[PDB]
Amino acid sequence: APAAVDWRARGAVTAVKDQGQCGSCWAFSAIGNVECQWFLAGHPLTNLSEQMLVSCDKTDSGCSGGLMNNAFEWIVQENNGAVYTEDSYPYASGEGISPPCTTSGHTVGATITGHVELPQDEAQIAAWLAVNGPVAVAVDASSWMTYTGGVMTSCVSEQLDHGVLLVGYNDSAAVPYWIIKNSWTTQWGEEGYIRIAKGSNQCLVKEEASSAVVG
Ligand SMILES: */C(=C\S(=O)(=O)c1ccccc1)[C@H](CCc1ccccc1)NC(=O)[C@H](CCCONC(=N)N)NC(=O)N1CCN(C)CC1
Numbered sequence: 583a584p585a586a587v588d589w590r591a592r593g594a595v596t597a598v599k600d601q602g603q604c605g606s607c608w609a610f611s612a613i614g615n616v617e618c619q620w621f622l623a624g625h626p627l628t629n630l631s632e633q634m635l636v637s638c639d640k641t642d643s644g645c646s647g648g649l650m651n652n653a654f655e656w657i658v659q660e661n662n663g664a665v666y667t668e669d670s671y672p673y674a675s676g677e678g679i680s681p682p683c684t685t686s687g688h689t690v691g692a693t694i695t696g697h698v699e700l701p702q703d704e705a706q707i708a709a710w711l712a713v714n715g716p717v718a719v720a721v722d723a724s725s726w727m728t729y730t731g732g733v734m735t736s737c738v739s740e741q742l743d744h745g746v747l748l749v750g751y752n753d754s755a756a757v758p759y760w761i762i763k764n765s766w767t768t769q770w771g772e773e774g775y776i777r778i779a780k781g782s783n784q785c786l787v788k789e790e791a792s793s794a795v796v797g
Pocket residue numbers: 601604605606607608642643645646647648649650720721723724742743744745790
């Protein structure tokens with residue numbers, strides 16, 4: 583695989599978001615992934631809707647949590663692959679209350695055909711990411727509350743409790759790391775991102791990695 587890849591530098595990643603006071607991390611992980619996959623299939627980088635999933639995806643639980651692999655299955659099996667634009671279905675759950683699902687008046691921003699569940703293997707995830715783009719991952723982020731910067735090498739790695747987006751890695755650094763996009767505003771971490779060390783299943787990062795497929 584390449585020594586280092588940063589999809590932000592390649593213009594594949596939209597701005598860091600704020601999930602607010604709502605456990606909608608899984609929707610920000612899954613939508614961030616679809617945004618990147620849609621741009622990498624040759625479309626313009628387009629802002630897509632987490633509210634679609636928080637309100638309409640009833641296989642997940644809204645502000646009380648979900649799975650990115652369920653979100654991708656809902657989009658494909660129940661919504662004919664469609665993911666609406668943010669502008670036409672804006673986020674409304676930042677105080678913890680999701681409006682009811684609305685079907686009409688929203689504009690499709692991207693379409694996906696399926697998703698792939700990647701191996702529980704950091705080297706294979708990195709090689710996949712270098713060729714195919716950012717990857718949604720579940721992590722244990724319980725020890726992330728004090729993180730301000732640097733490469734984390736003591737992440738508590740016990741229970742998957744959060745969903746985030748792998749946007750790159752660097753195997754050349756003194757401590758090899760993953761670059762992760764979080765959804766806790768740009769004030770948190772390194773302008774909204776965290777680096778965790780790569781190769782020791784920090785935060786259980788290898789355990790539930792996946793991506794939407796475009797085309
Ligand atoms: C988002 C995490 S967060 O940003 O709120 C957070 C992370 C770490 C520390 C503090 C806060 C949500 C929070 C869901 C929530 C909200 C209120 C109370 C209880 C739970 N986390 C998830 O959506 C989480 C994502 C990881 C999925 O991992 N994969 C597997 N476990 N296979 N999923 C869940 O929390 N749920 C909850 C129960 N379900 C119905 C779905 C999965």
